[model samples]
Target: ATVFRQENVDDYYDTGEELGSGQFAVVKKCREKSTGLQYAAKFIKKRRTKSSRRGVSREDIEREVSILKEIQHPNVITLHEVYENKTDVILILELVAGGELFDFLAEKESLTEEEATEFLKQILNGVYYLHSLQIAHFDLKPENIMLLDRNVPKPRIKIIDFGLAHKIDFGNEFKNIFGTPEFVAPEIVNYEPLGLEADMWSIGVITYILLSGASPFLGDTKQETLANVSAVNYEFEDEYFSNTSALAKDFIRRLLVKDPKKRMTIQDSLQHPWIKP
Candidate 1:
């Protein structure tokens, strides 16, 4: 059973409507009265029964808080504090108003190679920071990336969503079939043990999407998509390829390799020529 704590003095100031909802929790914007700072408060409902997969319980929520407490990085969304009631777990997180990168990409259709390159570089920097701490952000798609400025000429990306993240020994591999379908790596689809290289593979796919405005391996059915991902048989259109620099293509090729062991490491990826401006 869960216990209740003192309700915040501000009472979720502003509570500026719902931002989005996921399987386990809903995100809402709130303002802290003392500092007048905006934050995204994630309310995770505590279910009585485990309910198998989707629902989260009190213990699960506590674990989430523990993980957040351990992680401290500029690239990662910061967890301000946690509140609890009889039936809910409230997680106050740093608010990023720029919203999801997926929405930005969809609205713009496609970003110029220069624009995309900048975004990818920031992402790599963030990934490098996380990897240094031996954390693997299992989900690295655009949807999970939030921008910090909507009006900036070129907005910066912030890697959010730690639900799928986990810590493993550096250079060691893990086999847990998880993450969004489209952004998942080939090795992950095969249920093979994977490591940080798997996240690099997803980064490759994200770069492709940012440049081409379409998924590198997508299909009408999940099976077909997974097959294409596993086989690494997606076609690259000449129009997109023509505009991309050779160095960029080389970097993508290195990351998208079918074998995870041969993929580029985060340190090497940052030093790659393609990543240079």
Candidate 2:
């Protein structure tokens, strides 16, 4: 259970420019009054009606806060604190200044397979920790993956956006059909029970894009993209994978398995020769 302080966020922190925004929330740059440390403050609007899905539900925000509170890893974004007033609930989160992973990588002159593996390993490490506690990051896309600082030789991958994440219990079966079209697992497309393996499928897609710069299952339209995913319709074209290593392809292959049971676990993926340091 989360207890939101019934106070103003601006009173405690100096609000700055807008970092990002969604339908119901906006993230802004803020500096704490006492510590003078910068943080990303996410301001989410409260839903007026419980029945209609106009604004974010209280339960939804609480779930994200609870999950964020539980996580502690270098590769995962950290939560600072929370404040709530009449109109909005403000969450103070660690500022990831480097921006999205692809934007940082795109600026580079060139990229190598080994370098890509190193980055992927960081992501796997974070996910491995989450899975250890039976938590599944339902939304794993390029936008949610960030770099702590791109100025460094090897920028650290920081996984963000836990709004869709859920802690899976063995006694209960959780199913949800919400994720990026090309990155979603076949089970998700089929509306089957979801588990940690769904995130593994997303990792496979991310690896493929990092290595080849092409989406394996992307189609002309959203329906086509989802259909392709549900059917497991993808291929390692010669043009894209010709330069990619055999070990790298094998890693992706193992992760993109249609059967959740056959999919690579975080432990299995970390042990793969391509990513082993």
Candidate 3:
């Protein structure tokens, strides 16, 4: 197996520029000297003290690599290789230039119905593929979805950042409360066992954002946000609702169902009227 050693990290590539940064990681645009291929290298540092909490560890990195290896969908970002040293891991991923959907939404105010529908359809395809493989993308928000091509109205949305993903048996339940607070499902916030349906709830929130240019459950404080997320307290503005289709609203309503058993399934969502191309 080829291991990315620390000493050779600087030799194999030249860092072009910094792409983004977070508490535990930083991504940079780099080119492989051998093949002259552009790739995004995610440098993740693991702190010993931080390991006791939600901070990602070597095991988490290994799981991320494993999950990436298992997923082979066009909508999913490709993980080329994983390099590790004594204290950090470098994840070489496909370079997606268009950046996050958050920036696009911020600039565009809100997407038109056709634009939103096309993007949502691609997301549904990605989610459906994951569901078929018994893999659950525990995190699903605008930040994780990236645009690989900018020319199209709804460019290919490659789902990135699988650090929180996991596989479960068809009927199995999961109890880990790990996801972005705003996008989390009620069941997750309540500390209950969740299934794939929780992902559906997140999709509903994203759909709301795509159409309205704001988080449906946003509140003044963390506690307020949590309360709103728990209650699924969201309302469509009169103008926004007036412009959107009934099929679209129906799609959101189905996925956001309070009862997990009654929530839309991946298969059902794909076949839904609004998503059907």
Candidate 4:
């Protein structure tokens, strides 16, 4: 980012359509004239007055870039180049126009076991790649999935929104509880150091929501929801998953365990019948 900093952002890209917006930034679809390629550009206003970081510290930046910097897997999102101006720093990102997979599933109520299986397989493959690189996507919920293209017979997805991701090593654990409340593992609740198993726990909750259109541990309040997660208090409601395959339940059970020691690993999950089937 330092070397790539430039005085004029307009020199490279002619920005088009507003893709999305967040608390402090806006994302726009941009096109490059040199190669005629499209990318997403995120704009953040530089500190006007030594503003607070609001938890977006060095740790967060490191985690976000570690995976994006080196990976080129099909399921993981890629970062192009970055440019900076006097007032803003823009991150050029791979643009996926097919939109959010969560909204897709919500519109369909729930995915069939077969559809869910394929989606999870793609997700697990991506997750496995990250884990193999010793990167833990602390946030592995439904919101990050976006289709590569929808016009295809079967849509493929790429995981996005690495804002909460962490580059983890097996030996050293992270202690901060900064991920989405519904998907966070119980180890985070106990203020314990987390490893790859924490992300697997999140994958379990996501699998539950995808199958049933209901969050297994979500409650009226964040605290109560986290409390439920801490206790691993959840079930496969008969009204929800009565028709679901037994192996799917087995996979979820293995992940939602409160004990991280007993949770499934990415390699094991990829081999699981639910994911492999």
Specify the highest-lDDT model's number: 2
Clashing pairs in 3: none
Which prediction has more favorable TM-score, 1 or 4? 4
Against the true structure, candidate 3 reaches a TM-score of 0.90
Candidate 3 regions off by >4 Å? 1-7, 48-55, 105-111, 152-154
* Positional deviation of residue 227's Cα in model 4 after best superposition, in angstroms: 0.9
lDDT of each: 0.79, 0.88, 0.81, 0.80
lDDT by residue (tens digit), candidate 1, 122-217: 889889988887777778898888988767887878888777666667575665656777899998898887778889999989888877777888
Q: Which stretches of candidate 4 lie over 4 Å from their true place?
A: 45-59, 106-111
Model 1 reaches what TM-score against the true structure? 0.88
**What tens-digit string does per-residue lDDT give for candidate 2 at 1-277?**
6568886777889998998897789999999998989999999888957986767889888988999999999999999998988778788999999999988888779888987878888999999999998999988888899999988877798999888888888822565657789898888888888899999999999998988889999999999998888788889999888887888889999998999998988998998888883
> Model 4, poorest ten-residue lDDT window?
54-63
What lDDT is reached at residue 2 by model 3? 34
Candidate 4 lDDT by residue in tens digits, 96-141: 8888877666666456788878877888888899888877777778
* Best candidate, TM-score: 2
Q: Of 2 and 4, which scores higher on lDDT?
A: 2
Q: What is the TM-score of each candidate against the true structure?
A: 0.88, 0.96, 0.90, 0.90
Clashing pairs in 1: none
